[PDB]
């Protein structure tokens, strides 16, 4: 029916981001208190994220689990 | 009977076959089918593939690491990849909600217990709680 | 005891364990014991040779 | 001590380039100089790279743009690669004959490193006299722009 | 703290696809791993950020 | 008549509870209120 | 030694009967998806208008419901299930309501799915379930629900 | 029976203890929790 | 005047036996490199699923372990050593476990390396060590370990 008609859509899409820079990239602590020995732990990175508009890829194909959500137990 | 399915029951047999290195096919819910494999060489770890078709000169499978969960294996159905049948041309799949009528003209719901056929291609279906066979027309596919 | 603590769950902070019923019984036995002295009573039924 | 560490990426016609500012603070009595070099073995940095193989590179060994600590993941058109097929010596990579004209890509971890590109708030001073036989001069920490 | 203030998010690492043209150094227009973009991706990892 | 006693618990165990997402719909709704104190400027004093 | 069967609160689908009840002034209860459960009413007297209350309980001598004027939408009624407030109640929030397909274990160790045709209760407040094709009434623990 | 006494120390001396580095591995793990109070906004009051 | 030999907690390498024990429901203890030592279990009843607990001690009347559902990974089992929780215990954290090559001083003032074949304990809780080629059992202080 719409061979030569125009069509317009208002659409909802998942939010997505890519890492365009890594900023304050590494922060460190020699944690020693209440440890057998000195341990090195990497504290949180800060990321400068960028939206995906020019090129769009579908949501990744995650492997599902067969555990039913909100499952009764007795 | 039909030889189109041979599901594995025990996870122990699944692990035994994985040790032998044979590929597996693992179904999903409203989602693409998966192939699973054990990596060769020194380091042993699971690998997965989103592709399904047989390997050929024009088609090669892609394998990557993934932390596969035993829950998926134990819960979801599993088959040997080489011996899997793509489709059995029947209206209703196995383990599907269906509706029928009992011997006393009483309507009742059930799931398909077995899928059968004669030599002429006519398909007969057996429901849970019903030993007798049912025609394709006599059944009704219940809407979710 | 839990009813009077309605909305409060006694749980280890570093692991998901709640304290079991046995601890409550152990405490309750000492609660009834403390009361039995605090008012000079014998509260549970018991046979006495006096 | 180190602060503000930045992996600033510039994408240009020559290619991608990693350059950023990191601000450091030293101990006392240490007099750093321009273009001094530091390396932090503890901290590892992820990088990704790709190379094209030919009949000549297979024997010489691939010269890597970065250094190597350990390899995370290797791949090619035929899929992943196992430890039985590749080896690394003196920061160059060897492959067997199966990949004569294939491509190879790597996700790699390398040690963090820095050079002193400027010395900033360069000298701070104290005539420490309390609880000393005599006046003493002590150089307080420099700040470095790495 | 991070698990508290964060949001559930899928983290998938990036790596150059083998399909890159060895001579021009630019990617194939369409392939399963990367849809024209010159960078492929690994399987996702569930993460709070 | 009988004494009122607490008795036993009745809540069953639940595992893998998923979050609730507000459903998009063009239909109308009603915004559930809260009746409480309001803050305002002293506009008369502002004139002053 | 039991209590007679308890009727479930029938949802109303036809808009015409909803409007007729409203014109009669009978109270309606609307299960809004986003912002909970509300009551809907037609104003008495000549100045006709729809009113809403969130005083979400049966009217009582000690608990009188307060009604606020609101411009209730037709689409809201259509898309949201609505119940008569005379019926919908806390009395029986049964886990497996009537006409629900549930999975039950038969004596032959074969799981079957049947639709609950009748539900009743006993002295202890248990939920006895009647399944088509069987006379014995099952219990809450034995049964199971299959979703999607 | 016997009285409980402290006795002697048993810890040996250790010299040149090296730091522990978290090992990189593709394998899965489980994130050790802490169960405690959570802070949230009063979104209803935000609407108000 | 001693106590009989004490068995070491044999690590399990074959995945097949691990899975078989798990299917039998016997508890497993997994030494994760990054985040310590955890217990792994299969849920009882029909709803089969793996569970984890960090209630890292032998079960006791006064100390009952709490189990959380978790999606344990095959790779985790393979790469990490796993032990039966019936065996792995604080009873004997011996400095030189069985089959370990250790350096011992012989009477001729010549240091030799031998593999510990048997270990036992005495009244004082000492660790008597048996080395191949010798009958006399050595003590903790005399021996030494060579690494890499
Ligand atoms: Zn590609």
């Amino acid at each position: 029916k719409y061979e030569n008609h125009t069509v317009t859509l208002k659409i909802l899409m998942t939010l997505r981001y890519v890492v365009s820079d890594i900023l304050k990239e590494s922060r460190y602590q020699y944690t020693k208190f209440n440890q057998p020995k000195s341990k090195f732990e990497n504290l949180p990175q800060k990321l400068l994220l960028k939206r995906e508009d020019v090129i769009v890829l579908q949501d990744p194909y995650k492997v599902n689990d067969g555990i039913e959500e909100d499952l009764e137990i007795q | 009977p039909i030889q189109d399915a041979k599901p594995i029951d025990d996870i122990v047999d699944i692990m035994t076959y994985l040790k032998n290195g044979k590929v597996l096919r693992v179904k999903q819910d409203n989602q693409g089918d998966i192939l699973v494999r054990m990596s060769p060489g020194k380091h042993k770890f699971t690998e997965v593939s989103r592709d399904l078709d047989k390997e050929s000169f024009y088609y090669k499978r892609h394998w990557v690491l993934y932390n596969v969960s035993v829950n998926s294996l134990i819960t979801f159905d599993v088959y040997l990849d080489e011996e899997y049948s793509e489709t059995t041309k029947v209206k209703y799949p196995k383990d599907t909600i269906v509706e029928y009528t009992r011997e006393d003209q009483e309507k009742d719901v059930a799931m398909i217990k077995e899928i059968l056929t004669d030599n002429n291609g006519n398909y007969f279906y057996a429901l849970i709680g019903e030993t007798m066979l049912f025609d394709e027309n006599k059944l009704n596919k219940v809407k979710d | 005891v839990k009813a009077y603590m309605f909305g409060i769950v006694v749980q280890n902070p570093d692991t998901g364990q709640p304290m079991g019923d046995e601890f409550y019984n152990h405490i309750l036995e000492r609660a009834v014991g403390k009361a039995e002295r605090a008012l000079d009573i014998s509260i549970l039924p018991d046979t006495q040779h006096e | 001590a180190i602060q503000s560490q930045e992996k600033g990426t510039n994408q240009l016609d020559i290619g991608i380039l990693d350059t950023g500012t990191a601000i450091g603070t030293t101990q006392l009595e240490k007099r750093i100089s321009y273009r001094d070099r530091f390396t932090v073995p503890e901290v590892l940095m992820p990088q990704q790279m790709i190379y094209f193989v030919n009949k000549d590179r297979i024997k010489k060994g691939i010269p890597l743009y970065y250094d190597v600590k350990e390899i995370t993941y290797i791949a090619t058109q035929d899929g992943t690669v196992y430890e039985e097929d590749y080896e690394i010596k003196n920061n160059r990579l060897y492959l067997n004959e199966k990949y004569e004209n294939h491509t190879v890509t790597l996700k790699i971890l390398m040690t963090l490193r820095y050079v002193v590109s400027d010395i900033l708030k360069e000298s701070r001073y104290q005539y420490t006299k309390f609880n000393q036989p005599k006046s003493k001069f002590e150089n307080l920490p420099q700040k470095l722009l790495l | 703290f991070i698990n508290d203030r964060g949001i559930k998010v899928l983290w998938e690492e990036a790596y150059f696809c083998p399909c890159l043209n060895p001579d021009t150094g630019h990617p194939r227009v369409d392939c399963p791993r990367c849809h024209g973009k010159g960078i492929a991706y690994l399987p996702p990892k569930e993460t709070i950020m | 008549e009988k004494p009122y006693m607490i008795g036993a618990n009745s809540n069953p165990n639940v595992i893998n509870k998923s979050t609730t997402y507000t459903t998009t719909t063009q239909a109308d709704e009603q915004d559930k209120p809260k009746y409480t104190t309001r803050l305002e400027f002293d506009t008369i004093d502002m004139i002053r």
Side-chain angles (χ1 to χ4, degrees), chain E residues 16-20 27-28 30-40:
Chain E
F16 302 113
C17 202
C19 81
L20 274 164
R28 180 176 159 202
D30 173 28
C31 82
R33 296 308 313 195
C34 59
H35 309 77
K37 200 180 183 185
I39 299 163

Side-chain angles (χ1 to χ4, degrees), chain C residues 11 14-18 22:
Chain C
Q11 195 185 31
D14 300 339
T15 179
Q17 189 180 341
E22 181 53 34

Side-chain angles (χ1 to χ4, degrees), chain D residues 3-4 11 13 17 24 41 48 55-56 65 67 79 82 89-90 93 103 113 122 129 141:
Chain D
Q3 312 181 51
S4 198
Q11 189 173 2
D13 54 353
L17 195 69
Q48 57 264 24
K55 186 172 170 59
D56 292 330
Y65 309 152
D67 65 304
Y82 316 108
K89 304 181 183 178
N90 198 11
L93 162 63
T103 65
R113 293 191 292 282
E122 173 280 325
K129 316 193 289 177

Side-chain angles (χ1 to χ4, degrees), chain A residues 60-67, chain B residues 28 31-32 34 66 69 75-76:
Chain A
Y61 176 74
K62 190 184 181 204
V63 183
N64 202 358
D65 286 332
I67 311 302
Chain B
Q28 299 288 274
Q31 189 160 7
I34 300 169
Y66 191 82
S69 85
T75 63
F76 290 124

Side-chain angles (χ1 to χ4, degrees), chain B:
Chain B
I2 312 174
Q3 196 72 327
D4 286 337
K6 293 173 66 179
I8 304 297
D9 276 304
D10 200 326
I11 70 178
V12 173
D13 301 331
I14 287 169
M15 190 62 67
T16 306
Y17 279 114
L18 282 182
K19 205 81 183 289
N20 290 318
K22 296 192 175 184
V23 186
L24 304 170
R25 193 153 174 171
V26 187
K27 305 308 298 287
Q28 299 288 274
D29 297 326
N30 199 358
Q31 189 160 7
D33 195 351
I34 300 169
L35 302 183
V36 184
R37 181 180 179 214
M38 278 287 278
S39 200
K42 179 187 290 186
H43 299 302
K44 309 301 195 189
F45 42 74
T46 54
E47 291 177 350
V48 300
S49 167
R50 206 176 160 210
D51 290 343
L52 309 171
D53 204 341
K54 285 285 289 193
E55 291 184 43
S56 301
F57 56 82
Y58 66 96
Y59 191 102
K60 188 159 186 168
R61 287 167 171 173
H62 195 276
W63 298 106
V64 292
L65 279 84
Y66 191 82
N67 289 295
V68 180
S69 85
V70 298
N71 288 332
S72 69
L73 306 175
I74 198 170
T75 63
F76 290 124
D77 200 358
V78 179
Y79 307 114
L80 270 289
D81 173 62
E82 58 169 16
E83 205 156 18
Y84 179 79
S85 181
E86 299 297 328
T87 44
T88 315
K89 216 163 182 156
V90 293
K91 180 170 276 174
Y92 314 114
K94 186 182 170 187
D95 288 320
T96 302
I97 309 171
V98 286
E99 176 169 358
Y100 74 106
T101 314
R102 311 211 79 198
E103 298 194 357
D104 59 354
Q105 306 298 313
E106 288 190 8
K107 282 197 168 196
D108 184 20
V109 296
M111 278 198 203
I112 291 170
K113 200 175 184 178
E114 189 65 24
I115 294 169
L116 302 160
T117 192
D118 65 341
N119 292 28
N120 303 298
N122 309 294
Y123 292 104
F124 291 82
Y125 306 132
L127 309 183
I128 300 164
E130 302 296 344
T131 64
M132 65 197 163
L133 294 171
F134 299 93
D135 300 345
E136 186 177 309
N137 299 342
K138 286 182 176 175
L139 298 200
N140 300 269
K141 201 169 183 183
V142 178
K143 294 184 180 182
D144 302 326

